[PDB]
Nucleic acid binder design. Sequence first.
DNA 1: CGATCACGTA
DNA 2: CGTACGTGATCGC
Length: 577
Amino acid sequence: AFTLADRVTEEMLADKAALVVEVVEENYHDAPIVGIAVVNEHGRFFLRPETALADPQFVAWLGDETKKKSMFDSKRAAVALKWKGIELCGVSFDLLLAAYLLDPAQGVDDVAAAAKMKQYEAVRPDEAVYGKGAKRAVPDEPVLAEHLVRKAAAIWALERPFLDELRRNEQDRLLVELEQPLSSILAEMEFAGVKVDTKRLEQMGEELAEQLRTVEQRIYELAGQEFNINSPKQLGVILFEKLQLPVLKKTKTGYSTSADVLEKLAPYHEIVENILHYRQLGKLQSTYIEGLLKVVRPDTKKVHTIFNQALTQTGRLSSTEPNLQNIPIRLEEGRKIRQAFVPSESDWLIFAADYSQIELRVLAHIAEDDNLMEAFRRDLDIHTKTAMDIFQVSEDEVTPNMRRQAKAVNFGIVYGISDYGLAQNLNISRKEAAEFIERYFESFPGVKRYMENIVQEAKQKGYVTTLLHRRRYLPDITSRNFNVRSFAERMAMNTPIQGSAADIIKKAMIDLNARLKEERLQARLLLQVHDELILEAPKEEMERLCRLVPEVMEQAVTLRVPLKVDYHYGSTWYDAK
DNA sequence: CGATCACGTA
DNA sequence: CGTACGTGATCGC
């Protein structure tokens, strides 16, 4: 039972309401609002957006901090309203972020999935209402209005049970003081966007398109035949059938043609080096040149990513359209992609600051390993120091390969990769890899104690927690399937590390945003990617930012070891190196 | 169309 | 058998 309102009335502008501002397009930037539902103490209302968003009282109610709203995925509504010059304020409860903190593994992506967690089923999933894929469409107003009111009614009914469970888990402050404030900060960053020099991307593309055409012609002469190099199965016929190259690894479909297999086949035939070079070049061309160009808004000539705040099981942010968290850096040919990201105003610069080894520093603090804490208190090179300890040699005697192997051990912790995966990584035997690990644990007995304890804790409690009380349930921790149990064990070890690092970065983002406003700076957060924050600011602000941003990031939390931030600035993202 | 699969980037 | 997102091909439709 609901009012399909033709006009905004005062009873819809109570100071506590469940609100639904429906944006059905997946990319909500500059996207239509198809309807509005308000549920409060006085009733349930469906409003047409062409009515409500033109009503000054409704817009003023939207923007009034003291008018508390409860929503699901408020960031989608806030950004969509920003593109119409309308501020959304006073969102005191976000059901999507509540459900994500309670159990990230549920994959809660609509109101109905969140409602299921509390045995509430009087709302349909969005997919049942809008369809999927090709058939996706907005239904007519009677069907649309009911779905929106039911979602608002669900939000109305579910706020108190979700808050009760958050408080029981000691996660109420995590929602109210971290994730929800962060959601506003991410909305501003998405709306601001990042300026892209499309002409530089296009000139790189023409460069790649000439080099690809050369390598591809080379590959056809070496195969003595033309074929689709991008088809792994065709390429596998060329390599393993016509060229009789040894089959070192088989996928479930057929033969593996991954980069790491191909580098071991390089000595046998000159086609291999060229296939590798075609793969790196075509990855840049298809994924990063034509990929980025496709999502530059031609009106703003910016990219406006969407940060997914309620996706990963560790608490890390994710980002899409474009994904800027996998923009090339390691290889120089690909690193130059970052030259395409420029300040959005003349006389501004890009400022990037990044945590140095935040994960291992979190580990040192969590495990209280005296050796690992001393290494960071001395600001050592952690890979060199780990090589010194593992191999029981002095700093003068650490070769590059010893350092590369200690580095692989350290990354095998930061990422929770398997005992087996270290062997694959170092290309060694597993008994070699596992003996590396035992020497590491003899050099770092606190890390070992931590790994044993956190696994036991995960089995005993059913989950692990981060510094700021995020949790990840690990039901596969009791599995009799060894491969399944091991992963759960590795996630027991890895999640308090990666997730605590994610907590710290999020807190830094909140602390920075407040400091920037306190300092009356024009600098704006643009991007968070792994352990890095990227800003743009006037040329005139670089010196103050050189002191402010690292200070804020280093003080976000206090651990038993210091946090270290590196920072640079330049006329492009690439140059902020 | 759409879903599976193999590849790769961070 | 790390956290992801995106591209291409293939194959059923």
